[PDB]
Amino acid sequence: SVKSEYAEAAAVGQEAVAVFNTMKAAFQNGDKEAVAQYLARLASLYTRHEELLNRILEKARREGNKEAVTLMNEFTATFQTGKSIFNAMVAAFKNGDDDSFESYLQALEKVTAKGETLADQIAKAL
Numbered sequence: 001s002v003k004s005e006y007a008e009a010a011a012v013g014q015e016a017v018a019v020f021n022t023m024k025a026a027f028q029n030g031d032k033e034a035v036a037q038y039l040a041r042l043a044s045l046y047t048r049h050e051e052l053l054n055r056i057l058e059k060a061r062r063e064g065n066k067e068a069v070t071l072m073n074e075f076t077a078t079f080q081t082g083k084s085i086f087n088a089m090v091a092a093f094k095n096g097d098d099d100s101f102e103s104y105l106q107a108l109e110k111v112t113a114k115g116e117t118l119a120d121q122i123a124k125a126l
């Protein structure tokens, strides 16, 4: 169902959170080789989460679940804010700008933490 497909997507989001927090530790420790690999892993995870989210939104629409569509439109928009911050973080790493990297890293943390009250709302609406 769309509800099990959303729990699958929720798990992929949790995986990115787990990898994000080991990446943050690696950045702080100056282990740049690990950061590089973790950032590639996060990209692949965020790409996947976004595809599951689009499929879920398209399905809620075909199902006429107005509330779930509203919530998923709001959630997909904020997901894109996070993705832009992520891409900027990645660019900061390539550039060697640790000041920008730290900034974007803190910003992504807060965009994702906010999005959780909506994430939890979607689960109950689908």
Ligand SMILES: OCc1cccc2c1OCCO2
Residues within 6 Å of the ligand: 013, 046, 078, 079, 080, 081, 082, 083, 111, 112, 113, 114, 115, 116, 119
């Ligand atoms: O819960 C997932 C989530 C919520 C809010 C913002 C996000 C995000 O994941 C990718 C980056 O941006």
